[PDB]
């Protein structure tokens, strides 16, 4: 526990906030609470389709939610009937129409959250942690990442003593502020406890 968040330290130099609205000092708190509610609802509902970058920007009441997923087809549904239900469920627990327009991740091996959640799903499927970690490294490296680091922390393989393991390939220079490093941290709820999964994908400058 001695490292800054890669996204947060880069929030203004090369990255952008995944929430772009403006409020007044009194309105801001309720905007933020509603935003966090929508985010947690979305991440629990669309847990099948591999969404990674839900972005909330609300211009004057009406909002424009933008989810980026690697599998837009399943979350949109047939002719677009799941997306309408999602639209109205968002609108119900926000103020007025939440236009959710859905992007597409054309390289799911370069997004850190998709890699981390894949490793997590494999871990909850009682797959060897070393093999899952190495598979993710290989997949990202041959998909074209300039660097990938993946850290697995916890009771790995049912071990009584938790340990931290990791693999790195490429550069992933955390201290460089202009590095374009995607980062994700998820948890796999195994049968022996929680295993934390951290993924750094360094893509350029």
């Amino acid at each position: 526990g001695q490292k800054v968040h890669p996204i947060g330290i880069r929030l203004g130099v090369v990255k952008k906030h995944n929430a772009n609205w403006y409020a007044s000092p009194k309105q801001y708190s309720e905007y933020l609470i509603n935003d966090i509610q929508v985010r947690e609802y979305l991440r629990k509902k669309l847990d099948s389709a591999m969404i990674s970058n839900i972005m909330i920007e609300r211009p004057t009441g009406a909002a424009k939610i933008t989810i980026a997923t690697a599998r837009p087809g399943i979350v949109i549904g047939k002719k677009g009937e799941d997306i309408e239900r999602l639209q109205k469920e968002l609108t119900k627990m926000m103020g007025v129409p939440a236009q959710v327009n859905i992007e597409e991740i054309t390289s799911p091996d370069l997004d850190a959250r998709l890699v981390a959640d894949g490793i997590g799903s494999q871990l909850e499927r009682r797959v060897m942690f070393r093999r899952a970690m190495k598979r993710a490294v290989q997949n990202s490296m041959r998909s074209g990442a300039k660097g990938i680091k993946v850290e697995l922390s916890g009771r790995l393989g049912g071990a009584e003593i938790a340990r931290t393991e990791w693999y790195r390939e490429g550069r992933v220079p955390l201290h460089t502020l202009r590095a374009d490093i995607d980062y994700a941290s998820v948890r796999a709820e195994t049968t022996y406890g929680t295993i934390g999964v951290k993924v750094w994908i360094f893509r350029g400058e």
Partner: protein, 100 residues
């Protein structure tokens, strides 16, 4: 915090919302100098007779997500822990690490 304490804050705020207007009109009545002395005395007696949780003083600000009473920020409505988590994830617009 405990689910019971979160629901206790909720039911404490329900009475505040239910008697918000009555308190305002009664407060104007008791602070009215043109009003009769016995009238304002009786109004203050009613104010002290109102149900206890109806006061906005017994309300304790808690984190929206965790319900933590200590380490609260009004502008964000969350405790320091999850405030830091969301700022570092980038979920909180405008807010970033400061240095000067």
């Amino acid at each position: 915090a405990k689910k019971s304490m979160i629901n206790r804050e909720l039911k404490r705020e329900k009475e505040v919302a239910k008697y918000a207007d009555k308190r305002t009109k009664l407060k104007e009545t008791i602070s009215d100098m043109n009003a009769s002395d016995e009238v304002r005395m009786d109004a203050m007696l009613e104010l002290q007779a109102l149900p206890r949780n109806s006061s906005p003083v017994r309300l304790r600000n808690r984190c929206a997500i965790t319900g933590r009473p200590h380490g609260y920020f009004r502008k964000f409505g969350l405790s320091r822990n999850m405030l830091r988590e969301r700022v570092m994830q980038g979920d909180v617009p405008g807010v970033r690490k400061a240095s000067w």
